[PDB]
Design a protein around this motif. Sequence first.
Motif, PDB file in Angstrom:
ATOM      1  N   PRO A 164     -51.096  80.858  16.718  1.00 49.49           N
ATOM      2  CA  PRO A 164     -51.370  81.556  17.979  1.00 49.49           C
ATOM      3  C   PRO A 164     -50.239  81.507  18.996  1.00 49.49           C
ATOM      4  N   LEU A 165     -49.029  81.116  18.592  1.00 48.20           N
ATOM      5  CA  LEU A 165     -47.921  81.021  19.538  1.00 48.20           C
ATOM      6  C   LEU A 165     -47.618  82.373  20.173  1.00 48.20           C
ATOM      7  N   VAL A 210     -51.575  75.633  12.876  1.00 48.20           N
ATOM      8  CA  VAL A 210     -51.653  75.214  14.271  1.00 48.20           C
ATOM      9  C   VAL A 210     -50.777  76.100  15.150  1.00 48.20           C
ATOM     10  N   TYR A 211     -49.615  76.504  14.643  1.00 45.64           N
ATOM     11  CA  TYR A 211     -48.628  77.235  15.428  1.00 45.64           C
ATOM     12  C   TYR A 211     -48.780  78.748  15.321  1.00 45.64           C
TER      13      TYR A 211
END
Lengths: 51, 50
Positions: A50-51, A47-48
Amino acid sequence: QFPKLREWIGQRVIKDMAAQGYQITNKLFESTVGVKRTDIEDDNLGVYGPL
Amino acid sequence: AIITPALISALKTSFQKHFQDALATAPSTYLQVATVIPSTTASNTYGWLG
């Protein structure tokens, strides 16, 4: 600009030009985010990413 | 000449299949409004970052 041409009246007149300026100062900007490291470590889904 | 009307009057015919597939059905359209996402289990969970 140079003064406009005018009809000589009897004695020529000294004129002057008008010069001006403009100044701008730099500004400093910031943007930040904090995340707990365990969440990134426990990120099997991705989830993280594409930070 | 004389014959029962259940054998000759019944067999004096030629079956044709012109009527088969005369009409059609509405063409596929869901492609223009949907994407295809294959699935490999009971359900699919989606997650995106803000």
